[PDB]
Amino acid sequence: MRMFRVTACVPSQTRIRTQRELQNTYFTKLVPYDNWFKEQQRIQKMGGTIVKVELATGRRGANTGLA
Amino acid sequence: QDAITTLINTSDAQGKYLDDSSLDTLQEYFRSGDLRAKAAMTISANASTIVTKTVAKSLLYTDITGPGGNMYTCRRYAACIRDMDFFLRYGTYAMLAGDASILDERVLNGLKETYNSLGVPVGATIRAVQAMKEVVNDMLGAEAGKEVGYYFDHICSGLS
Amino acid sequence: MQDAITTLINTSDAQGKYLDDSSLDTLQEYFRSGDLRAKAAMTISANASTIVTKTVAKSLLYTDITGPGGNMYTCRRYAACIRDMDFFLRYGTYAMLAGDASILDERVLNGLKETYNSLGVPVGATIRAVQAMKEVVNDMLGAEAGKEVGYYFDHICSGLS
Amino acid sequence: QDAITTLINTSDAQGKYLDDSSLDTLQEYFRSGDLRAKAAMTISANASTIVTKTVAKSLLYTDITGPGGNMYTCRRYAACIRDMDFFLRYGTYAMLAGDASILDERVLNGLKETYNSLGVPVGATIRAVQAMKEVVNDMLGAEAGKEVGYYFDHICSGL
Amino acid sequence: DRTNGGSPVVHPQQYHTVPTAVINGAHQRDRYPNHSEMQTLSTFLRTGLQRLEIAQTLAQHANEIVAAGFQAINIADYGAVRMKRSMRDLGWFLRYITYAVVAGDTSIITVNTRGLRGIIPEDVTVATTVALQEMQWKSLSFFPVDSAAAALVRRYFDVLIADYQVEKPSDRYRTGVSKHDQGLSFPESYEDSGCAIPRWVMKPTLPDSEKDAVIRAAYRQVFERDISGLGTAELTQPISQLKGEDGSMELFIRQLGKSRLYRQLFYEPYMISRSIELACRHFLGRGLSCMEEFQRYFELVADQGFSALVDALVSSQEYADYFGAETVPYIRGLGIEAQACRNWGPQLDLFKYSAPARKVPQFVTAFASYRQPLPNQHPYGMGNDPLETQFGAIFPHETTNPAAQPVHFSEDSRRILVGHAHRKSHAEISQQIFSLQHSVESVILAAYRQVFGCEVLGSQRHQAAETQLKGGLITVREFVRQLAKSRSFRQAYWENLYMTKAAEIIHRRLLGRPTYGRRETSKYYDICGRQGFYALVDALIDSDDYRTAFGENTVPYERYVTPRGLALRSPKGPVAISKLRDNPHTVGEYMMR
Amino acid sequence: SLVTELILSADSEARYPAPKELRIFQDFVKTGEQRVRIAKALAANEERIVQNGSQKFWERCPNTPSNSGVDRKTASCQRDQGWYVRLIAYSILAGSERPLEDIGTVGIKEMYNNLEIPIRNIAECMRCLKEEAMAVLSDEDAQEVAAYFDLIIQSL
Amino acid sequence: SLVTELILSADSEARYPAPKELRIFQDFVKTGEQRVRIAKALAANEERIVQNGSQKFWERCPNTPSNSGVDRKTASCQRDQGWYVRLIAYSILAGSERPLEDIGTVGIKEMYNNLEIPIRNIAECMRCLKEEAMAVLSDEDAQEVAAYFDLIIQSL
Amino acid sequence: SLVTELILSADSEARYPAPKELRIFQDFVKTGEQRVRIAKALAANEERIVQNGSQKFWERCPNTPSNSGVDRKTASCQRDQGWYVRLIAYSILAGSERPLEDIGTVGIKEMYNNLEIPIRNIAECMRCLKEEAMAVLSDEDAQEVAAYFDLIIQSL
Numbered sequence A: 001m002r003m004f005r006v007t008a009c010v011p012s013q014t015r016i017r018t019q020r021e022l023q024n025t026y027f028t029k030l031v032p033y034d035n036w037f038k039e040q041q042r043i044q045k046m047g048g049t050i051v052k053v054e055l056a057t058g059r060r061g062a063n064t065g066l067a
Numbered sequence B: 001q002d003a004i005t006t007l008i009n010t011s012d013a014q015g016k017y018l019d020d021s022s023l024d025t026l027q028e029y030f031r032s033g034d035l036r037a038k039a040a041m042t043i044s045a046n047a048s049t050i051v052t053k054t055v056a057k058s059l060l061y062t063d064i065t066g067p068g069g070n071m072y073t074c075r076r077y078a079a080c081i082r083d084m085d086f087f088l089r090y091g092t093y094a095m096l097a098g099d100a101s102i103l104d105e106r107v108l109n110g111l112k113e114t115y116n117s118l119g120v121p122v123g124a125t126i127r128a129v130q131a132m133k134e135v136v137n138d139m140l141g142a143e144a145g146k147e148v149g150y151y152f153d154h155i156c157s158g159l160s
Numbered sequence C: 001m002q003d004a005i006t007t008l009i010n011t012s013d014a015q016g017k018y019l020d021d022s023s024l025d026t027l028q029e030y031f032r033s034g035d036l037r038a039k040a041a042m043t044i045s046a047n048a049s050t051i052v053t054k055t056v057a058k059s060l061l062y063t064d065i066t067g068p069g070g071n072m073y074t075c076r077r078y079a080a081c082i083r084d085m086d087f088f089l090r091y092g093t094y095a096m097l098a099g100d101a102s103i104l105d106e107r108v109l110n111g112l113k114e115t116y117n118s119l120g121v122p123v124g125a126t127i128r129a130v131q132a133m134k135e136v137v138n139d140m141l142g143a144e145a146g147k148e149v150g151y152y153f154d155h156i157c158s159g160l161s
Numbered sequence D: 001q002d003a004i005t006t007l008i009n010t011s012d013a014q015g016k017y018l019d020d021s022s023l024d025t026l027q028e029y030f031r032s033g034d035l036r037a038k039a040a041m042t043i044s045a046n047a048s049t050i051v052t053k054t055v056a057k058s059l060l061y062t063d064i065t066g067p068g069g070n071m072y073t074c075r076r077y078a079a080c081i082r083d084m085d086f087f088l089r090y091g092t093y094a095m096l097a098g099d100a101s102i103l104d105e106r107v108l109n110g111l112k113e114t115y116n117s118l119g120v121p122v123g124a125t126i127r128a129v130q131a132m133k134e135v136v137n138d139m140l141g142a143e144a145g146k147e148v149g150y151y152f153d154h155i156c157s158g159l
Numbered sequence E: 001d002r003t004n005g006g007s008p009v010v011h012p013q014q015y016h017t018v019p020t021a022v023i024n025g026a027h028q029r030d031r032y033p034n035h036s037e038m039q040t041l042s043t044f045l046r047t048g049l050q051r052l053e054i055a056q057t058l059a060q061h062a063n064e065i066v067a068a069g070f071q072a073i074n075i076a077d078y079g080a081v082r083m084k085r086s087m088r089d090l091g092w093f094l095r096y097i098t099y100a101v102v103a104g105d106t107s108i109i110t111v112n113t114r115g116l117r118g119i120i121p122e123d124v125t126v127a128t129t130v131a132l133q134e135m136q137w138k139s140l141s142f143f144p145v146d147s148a149a150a151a152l153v154r155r156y157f158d159v160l161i162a163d164y165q166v167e168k169p170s171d172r173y174r175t176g177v178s179k180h181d182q183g184l185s186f187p188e189s190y191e192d193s194g195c196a197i198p199r200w201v202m203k204p205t206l207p208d209s210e211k212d213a214v215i216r217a218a219y220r221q222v223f224e225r226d227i228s229g230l231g232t233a234e235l236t237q238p239i240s241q242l243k244g245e246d247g248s249m250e251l252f253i254r255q256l257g258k259s260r261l262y263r264q265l266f267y268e269p270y271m272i273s274r275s276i277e278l279a280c281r282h283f284l285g286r287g288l289s290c291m292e293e294f295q296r297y298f299e300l301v302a303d304q305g306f307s308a309l310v311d312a313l314v315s316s317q318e319y320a321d322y323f324g325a326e327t328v329p330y331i332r333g334l335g336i337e338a339q340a341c342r343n344w345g346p347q348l349d350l351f352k353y354s355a356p357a358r359k360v361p362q363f364v365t366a367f368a369s370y371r372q373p374l375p376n377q378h379p380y381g382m383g384n385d386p387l388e389t390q391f392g393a394i395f396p397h398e399t400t401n402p403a404a405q406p407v408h409f410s411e412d413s414r415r416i417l418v419g420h421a422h423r424k425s426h427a428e429i430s431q432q433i434f435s436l437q438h439s440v441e442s443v444i445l446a447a448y449r450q451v452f453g454c455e456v457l458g459s460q461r462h463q464a465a466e467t468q469l470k471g472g473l474i475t476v477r478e479f480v481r482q483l484a485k486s487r488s489f490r491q492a493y494w495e496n497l498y499m500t501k502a503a504e505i506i507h508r509r510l511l512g513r514p515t516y517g518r519r520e521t522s523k524y525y526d527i528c529g530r531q532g533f534y535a536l537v538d539a540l541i542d543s544d545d546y547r548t549a550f551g552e553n554t555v556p557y558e559r560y561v562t563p564r565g566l567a568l569r570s571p572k573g574p575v576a577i578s579k580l581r582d583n584p585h586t587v588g589e590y591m592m593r
Numbered sequence F, G, H: 001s002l003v004t005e006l007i008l009s010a011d012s013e014a015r016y017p018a019p020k021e022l023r024i025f026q027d028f029v030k031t032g033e034q035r036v037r038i039a040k041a042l043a044a045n046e047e048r049i050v051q052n053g054s055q056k057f058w059e060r061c062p063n064t065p066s067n068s069g070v071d072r073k074t075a076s077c078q079r080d081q082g083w084y085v086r087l088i089a090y091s092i093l094a095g096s097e098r099p100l101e102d103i104g105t106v107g108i109k110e111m112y113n114n115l116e117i118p119i120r121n122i123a124e125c126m127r128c129l130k131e132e133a134m135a136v137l138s139d140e141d142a143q144e145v146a147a148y149f150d151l152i153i154q155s156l
Ligand SMILES: *[C@@H](C)[C@H]1/C(=C/c2[nH]c(/C=C3N=C(/C=C4\NC(=O)C(CC)=C4C)C(C)=C\3CCC(=O)O)c(CCC(=O)O)c2C)NC(=O)[C@@H]1C
Pocket: E012, E013, E184, E186, E190, E334, E337, E338, E339, E340, E341, E342
């Protein structure tokens, strides 16, 4: 299935992480196509600066066979 | 994408039906299907044996296997034969599909970067892939071995 | 993560033999610094809030990076900086006890600089903060154990530079 | 909840310092603790062999491993083995705690409902756990085997 | 008044000892404790000599310790109650120091002391810390300070003073994730008392064994158990993509969810709603908070499958807020975060390892039926309602497939029963009566078919009562009582039965109707518990309802049932509930005018 | 297609083609001659299929943008009918409805609502084209084509 | 069974079975008589299959618990062999290895490792049973049976 | 190592290493001298240990690829035995089987199945090395090395 290689840093603005709830924000992550719209919207909702979006798997203009 | 899917994509880009040349391509695939299925049965029959022989004939008894080498430690030998089984299964998939698009989508992308990141030696890896090509060529014959070894050379170039 | 013993074993394992006399002598050094490393860890664990207090007082407070438009302005960001300082101290403690800066290179320094450049955290400011925290550990631990913990705080700074 | 927790819970519920009988109970726990730990280590190093021997002597060549039995269909056999390992390791947890609270909170609650929903024979389970008690007794010694068979018997009580 | 979500047994941890913490760690890693955890337990049990004797000497000299314990306050100005609380607090602090010394952990001190700065009026905090320092000095004064455990007593007193000097610590907040989700607050004392849960974070540069530990914890979160030892966890491409520099823990959680292993475990044996609840457990670490969350999930599954539900759970704001990118989901229970009361019963039945043992979806039933009136149910739950067949005491087992909906009915509450009198007619219900159906023999047989819903074997015949009734010595009522006092009746309806279930089924066989409420059921249960089976049989036969309905010469018959009984007695639906619409016209087929 | 779906089903449990997958592949390759015959027939007679389908669809549903007097709308409807029967030809060639799904029948409702075209009118028209596809094809040919025509019907 | 996975694949995406899946169902439904014949064949000559397989297995490996002089262990080995060829017959009848998987290969290694029996010994005995089924069955039946045999070989 | 695992357990819950963990630290540090004595003892006599383990293992299990007549295979088996006793000494030095697990008992079964040597043969050979380490080491020493021997038993 066609994948997105996405690097983004999503900051927290509504919670203070005490010592363990802190995880990371600068993630590079392979994203499936059918979820990337919702992941882009989610990390835009939380307030993340998306610095790098490329097509990891699949080609451009695929009429079929892309999944 | 497979051979039929690539043909449909090309004729959908050009917007027309499949012409007589693309129908010749499709009849080529459809008459190769039976022997490709027999070779898929054969590769599914002895995959572990093929991996055993190829690690013996290409990767063992060089100092890559011993200490300070990349297949040293039990887990790295397991990871190496895991990668060899990956290449065998995905070359089998590409043989069934008639196109190396599955290798370009799931195998070859990111793999060179990850192998250079982990310190995996690409040269011995490509040697292991073509030794696998030789063993499959030996245990299946010329024609089916040629068809699967073409995709093995595709993997060999993708690592290259 | 890897500790001093684990790295000694790992070089000797990649070479293919038992621990030679030099590797065992490094092991002697580690095993005879273990008591002071444990005591320093107890002290750092007991006084963590105080160390962050004096550290932020001597490097970060009273300058315009805490002013309006600054990075530690808007209280939640200041508390974020407190959390980062406490995290750096605790991971320097882990590095000091293990005898190795591998845990920092795996869990602290891996992608932290890029992260801060994405959030707009001033890298030089937190580096000065880590050197101030090194000075605080120096003052309230002693010269010897203070220098030892300062080695891994230097590793944090170098991975941040 | 270990034995220390239950003792301090009683003392704080009555609102006093640890009484002499309470301190004596802590003394028995604390100076049997070394044999408890030793038994815990050798139970950790020989858990697989114990489960093997207990299935061999209690659950093999009965008609529950045969067709239509509850330990037919190899995945059900692996589930049976894993249940035996869970029982061994949680009896070990209780042995190290000195209290059956980890059993009551993590094994015996949830187990009867699961076994009756899945159709698992309770009797075959209890005879397997008592075979476990005998095997740990034989490979440990009378005192350590009795001290861990107390918790194996608590598990059998909840079944 | 409102239906019950269940009150499960909960053990809230007030602190941690040394053994409890080690066993908690080993349990939360699903392994035997290892050599360093072994050394933890054995070294603490080694120091147990010194710890127990420290507690001995402190408890022995407690009176003088708190007698010895800035501007010293006046007794008369402070107040008698406040002086009493000062002395009580001081003795309490010393007690908790001895508790910590025996337990080997200062978790009890730190949890119970850290947020005390303003609970104590905070104008006497200088007096408080001076008194605690003086207690430290005195406790060490009669416990020799050269190199002994007086260093330990000094450290524990120092930890107590350090916890007490900590000012107002911020309460943890479980913020509401939607308009339907209530936000919750959480004291830090409750956070620090709660059992430590490992936070499995997978970074790309971790060693292999740490990575495999994170994989195993991912299996334990998602598949509820370790599947890595089995060959079913052959997911070599997802694992391999996860280990190195790509395919992070969130993508791996999604790949575990969409795998056919997860479908075989938590989707194949379940209906959609129970599957949604289990997915909520396995991908967010918590159950359904509210009904509207379940509406969202159920509609989404209905138009897009369960894999899209997994995609939506792991793609949600709450998932990235708690578990982010590379943190394994963890179960969010009692001390991990603040708990809601809304889903308390279902979520504590869901976090339990026997959550797959329940098939009926617990969250939706509780959430929906709270917003509904009381159900038609036996007062002691639905397991006490037998199956309305001709014979057989068939009750729902509490353990085998628990489909339990607990409900509190009042004492005066009465069940609605569907009577056969208003329904049907007469000469339609007087065919099932059998008074004095005039032959004696038929009346014996019908009295059997009431007492035991089918005709019984010869060994179950009460032939002496047959001879008595054929001779006219006893009437029909006494014969029915003798049949209900026969041994085979006791075996059929009293021995292999829960006692209130036994009383209810005997009431249904001897009265022909279910009980109404806690009046009747309470009286029968009290009778059969303080007096026994024959006493209940005599009290039911001599019940005024038996005399009004069945008199003395009439065999009992079924008169009332539960509405579920008629729903069973109409599998094609009820007769005429609204006029049917045979040969209707719909739009589209009409529009093609 | 059937091949890609079989491979990704083999990919999912990280394994080789199972005893059934090769069997389905052999069935596909041996029915390939029939599938190519269907595709050739459809590509040869698409013009008259579209014309007869539009004839029946306007005799049946006339309250359509297809016959609202604008010739551009009518020509667009004819082109859409030819496109959909070409996608059915792609489906029978590929052995699976995925050329139909990935091109014609996934975003179909949102798109044709955006065009303000009534969805059930398109369903009626696809039923007309399916009936004419029966009218020109043999029994197995028309069964395999009616498969994907009812895929288009379901997507509307 | 194969049709179970067809229905489960139509499920979990909340859709009806595609006519491609219906075609898989048709093909399996017409191969059913051949599969019933193969299962009858296995139930016919299972006795000689276990006898000859144990013979060649002890010929190629005498260092097994099955020939350690304890005849109860040889009875258990014979019965395991017979159960497994019964499961392969079940797999033929169901058209998928999922009966074989869910009865004899999911917790395979845990069971046999508890039984103190080498895994590759069972694998080599399965190779012997595969060769016996090769010897006694016709070529298409031989391929169909030996494929599920190979599935067991992979499980070990 | 024990140090690493102490640090990891103090991690993953974001806490400092507890006083009990530092007791473990300061005691494993006082365990150090006996650990160096064991590593030196196992390194000093390793050749005779592998010789006598090979002697008893060839006495007890002769159906091995080590005594098939190929001295290359024999030398490789002796190399594996020396490597494993080296790893067990490493585990004494570290205080836990973490070097043992990471280097030799994580992908043990998959590798030796790629090398086709029977797993129980390796188990018998390591049992021979275990009893020679009982022969050459004192009682406490025999315990600390036999622990990781039992770990190697579990993996095979
Ligand atoms: C004084 C009020 C009484 C008292 C209280 C007490 N409660 C708990 C624990 C909990 N209380 C709640 C309550 C709520 N959760 C909700 O969502 C709502 C509505 C907003 C309420 C009211 C919950 C869920 C808990 C569990 C713990 C948690 O914080 O989530 C305790 C502690 C229990 C223990 O022993 O651990 C106490 C002490 N105690 C009294 O004696 C007063 C009568």
